[PDB]
A paper describes a structure:
The human assembly factor Coa6 participates in the biogenesis of the CuA site in complex IV (cytochrome c oxidase, COX). These structures show that Coa6 has a 3-helical bundle structure, with the first 2 helices tethered by disulfide bonds, one of which likely provides the copper-binding site. Patients with mutations in Coa6 suffer from mitochondrial disease due to complex IV deficiency.
Finally, we determined and refined the crystal structure of the pathogenic mutant protein W59CCoa6 to 2.2 Å resolution by X-ray crystallography. The structure of W59CCoa6 shows four molecules (A, B, C, and D) per asymmetric unit. The noncovalent dimer observed in the WTCoa6 structure is maintained for W59CCoa6 (between molecules A [cyan] and B [gray]) through contacts along Helix α3 from each monomer. In addition, each of these molecules form a covalent dimer with another molecule of W59CCoa6 through a disulfide bond between the introduced residue Cys59 on each chain (covalent dimers between molecules A/D, [cyan and salmon] and B/C [gray and gold], Fig 4B). In this way, the asymmetric unit is composed of a dimer of dimers (a noncovalent dimer of disulfide bridged dimers). The superposition of the WTCoa6 structure with the noncovalent A/B dimer of W59CCoa6 yields a r.m.s.d. value of 1.2 Å for 113 common Cα atoms. These minor structural differences originate from a slightly different association between the monomers in the dimers, rather than specific structural rearrangements. Importantly, in the WTCoa6 and W59CCoa6 structures, the positions of the proposed Cys58–Cys90 Cu(I)-binding sites are identical. Under reducing conditions, the elution profile for the W59CCoa6 protein was identical to that of WTCoa6, corresponding to a dimeric protein. Oligomerization of the protein, through the creation of intermolecular disulfide bonds may inhibit or eliminate targeted protein–protein interactions between Coa6 and proteins such as Sco1, Sco2, and COX2, which are critical for its function.
Author numbering:
A (entry chain D): 50 to 113
B (entry chain C): 56 to 111
C (entry chain A): 56 to 113
D (entry chain B): 49 to 113
Amino acid sequence: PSMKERQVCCGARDEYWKCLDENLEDASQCKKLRSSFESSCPQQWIKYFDKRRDYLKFKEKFEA
Amino acid sequence: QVCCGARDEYWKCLDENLEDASQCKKLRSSFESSCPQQWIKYFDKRRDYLKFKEKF
Amino acid sequence: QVCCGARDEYWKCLDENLEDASQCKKLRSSFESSCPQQWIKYFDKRRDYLKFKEKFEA
Amino acid sequence: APSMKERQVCCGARDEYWKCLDENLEDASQCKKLRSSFESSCPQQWIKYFDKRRDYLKFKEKFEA
């Protein structure tokens, strides 16, 4: 998986996660960005980032 | 692998395999994985030119 | 190793220390080592804008 | 530990220097300008590495030919 593929995957993840921050984890507002994210990233990266997002957002509330 | 490190090892394989890219697919991956695509485009043009100049 | 991994670890440190860059100088080095300078400049503008937007509303 | 940009600039400076040496069959004198640009562009331990790497590669070529 090339450096350009990583750049493009990260960019698509940045935009997707940004949307989620501006709509309190509401997938329905970020449908096209989620689609680009899946199109832009290897299957095992998508799983990594989805699980990381859960951990981080739940750790916040456990701490809150 | 530093970008120019992975590039130099790819170029070494090309040398040792008479410029036949088919023999160097593994090292082509590490190169692509180590270097921005803009740099790879530059590096491919420098190599193509310099190897051609060599034979000339 | 991956440019965005090193960026995210640097940004995680900035969060944890009240956006205080002086604490996170180690991971700033690894960020600079992992990412081309053109990407760093963009990422630094993105962070400045987003962190500022955080306050401007909250 | 040098940044990615520092490694890139070191590599470019090294490339142009090694190119010059190839065009003058290792004659240092005709590349002194590029030599200087290589030393300023590269950390001390990188200069050492690429100098010893150059020697090994050139002498390995002669040994085999």
